[PDB]
């Protein structure tokens, strides 16, 4: 990155795991092991992640044969920013214009992540990894 | 915070120091000690910072007597993004939609930081830290 943005492991794995659940939402519950396998995630880390997402009401556990985990809301009702919000935790006043610049950076990030839902990601996933007859590439 | 964005020490101090130089551009060179004092920065850290900014052509040293450091370009020709860029430094393909989301985040940050110059910051500084008759609020 030119601006040197670094994404935390928790953000990256949180979104990856939620997206994997979105990809399986219609078909039903999947095991955590299967998510870890498809996404190249460590199972212990994923276990801890899912625990928080579950407390937040973003994912739920089911007791079936195909038991396992499913999204607790439809992908269209989960913004990427919602996932990030869940995972994240002598005096005098002197205004800092520099801090105001960072506030503007923060606001723009919040705007992007609130503008994308898991359903949007599902749509993009379909368009970008598809295959077609060559004459249809424009 | 909300998204939990954290700004590095180097970005924060890099921009603070460059802005302090912008605030003194017309008046001329200032010492690094003076910058460290006004901005609450560690002198050793600032000296290392300034060395890179100098190599990049963003600041220059002047011999003088009351010499010191000044911006090497006018504040209107230095984007905050320019400062950040200076300071920063088998096989198979599988598209990641999650990575594409972060690419979009990166783009928007780049756009904000390229849209603000040190001159814009000088104007904002004036406006926000002013004093006037109360009837004009």
């Amino acid at each position: 990155g030119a601006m040197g943005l670094k994404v935390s492991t928790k953000g990256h794995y949180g979104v990856q795991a939620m997206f994997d659940l979105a990809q399986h939402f219609g078909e039903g519950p999947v095991s955590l092991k299967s998510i870890a396998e498809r996404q190249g995630l460590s199972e212990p880390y994923l276990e801890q992640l899912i625990a928080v997402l579950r407390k937040a009401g973003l994912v739920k556990s089911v007791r079936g044969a195909q038991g396992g985990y499913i999204l607790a809301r439809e992908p269209r009702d989960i913004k990427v920013g919602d996932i990030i919000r869940v995972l994240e935790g002598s005096l005098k006043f002197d205004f800092s214009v520099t801090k105001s610049v960072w506030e503007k950076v923060k606001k723009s990030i919040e705007e992007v992540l609130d503008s994308i839902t898991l359903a949007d990601m599902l749509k993009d996933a379909e368009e970008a990894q598809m295959a077609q007859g060559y004459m249809y590439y424009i | 915070g909300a998204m939990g964005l954290k700004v590095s020490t180097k970005g924060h101090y890099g921009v603070q120091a460059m802005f302090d130089l912008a605030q003194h551009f017309g008046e001329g060179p200032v010492s690094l000690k003076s910058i460290a004092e006004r901005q609450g920065l560690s002198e050793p850290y600032l000296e290392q910072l300034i060395a890179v900014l100098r190599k990049a052509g963003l600041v220059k040293s002047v011999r003088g007597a009351q010499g010191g450091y000044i911006l090497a370009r006018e504040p209107r020709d230095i984007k905050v993004g320019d400062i950040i860029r200076v300071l920063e430094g088998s096989l198979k393909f599988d598209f990641s939609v999650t990575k594409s989301v972060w690419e979009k985040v990166k783009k928007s940050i780049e756009e904000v930081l390229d849209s603000i110059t040190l001159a814009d910051m000088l104007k904002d500084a004036e406006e926000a830290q002013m004093a006037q008759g109360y009837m004009y609020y």
Binding site: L5, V7, G11, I109 | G4, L5, K6, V7, G11
Partner: peptide, 6 residues
């Protein structure tokens, strides 16, 4: 600590 710059 979700994202940092730079």
């Amino acid at each position: 600590a979700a994202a940092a710059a730079a």
